[PDB]
Amino acid sequence: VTIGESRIIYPLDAAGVMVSVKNTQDYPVLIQSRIYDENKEKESEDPFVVTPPLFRLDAKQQNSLRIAQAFPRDKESLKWLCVKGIPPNNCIKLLVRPNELKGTPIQFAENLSWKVDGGKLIAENPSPFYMNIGELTFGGKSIPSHYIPPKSTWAFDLPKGLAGARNVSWRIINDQGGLDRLYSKNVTL
């Protein structure tokens, strides 16, 4: 059972950040750590280097990884750190954040606007931060979470029975991995 949802905030053009990994089992695991693009696809040339990229983490052991940059300055960019283990898969958001950005995601959570078209509920995020939805309800039905990209949109597939629905509520996940306060709006017609 996991509590909360960690994310890594990488200040844009920092030389690197350190990240702790822990083996929760009483057996050793070989872990491979790699940074992927926002869709967990391997990039042509990795935008980040992880050290050690591959090592043996013994039973109950904790170890630090170095993540080093190898980007727009008006908004965040999303990558993923994925740690894959086998005997000798956990993906976490790596939010590349320009120092130029003012404020934090919770200050912009209320600013999402919503439309319905083509059977989808579409969020618009005018802010420079990923609005990482952690709870989403439309017409009283839970909708699976997905981030709303900065200065962009995200369109959610809807379960049956929601034609005509108006009422959306949401919570973002804050930088600390917790769920923020609830906001409620009607869909713009």
Q: Which helix (H) or strand (E) holds 156?
A: strand 152-157
Is position 98 an interface residue for a copy of itself (rule: CB under 8 A)? no
The CB-of-135 to a copy of itself minimum distance in angstroms stands at 7
For the chain, how far is it from start to end, CA to CA, in angstroms? Answer: 40
The CB-of-109 to a copy of itself minimum distance in angstroms stands at 13
Query: Contact, 108 vs 150, CB < 8 A?
Result: no
Q: Is the dihedral of CA 150, 169, 143, 119 positive or negative?
A: negative
Is position 107 an interface residue for a copy of itself (rule: CB under 8 A)? no
Is position 34 an interface residue for a copy of itself (rule: CB under 8 A)? no
Residue where the block lists tokens 């989808």: 120
The CB-of-65 to a copy of itself minimum distance in angstroms stands at 8
Burial class (CB in 10 A: 0-12, 13-18, 19+), 130: buried
Tell which one of 55, 74, 77, 83 touches a copy of itself (CB under 8 A): 83
The CB-of-42 to a copy of itself minimum distance in angstroms stands at 19
For residue 148, what are its two tokens? 């709303």
Tell which one of 28, 85, 98, 139 touches a copy of itself (CB under 8 A): 85
Q: Which residues bind a copy of itself (CB under 8 A)?
A: 1-9, 17-25, 29, 31, 57, 64, 81, 83-85, 90, 92, 134-135, 171, 173, 175-180
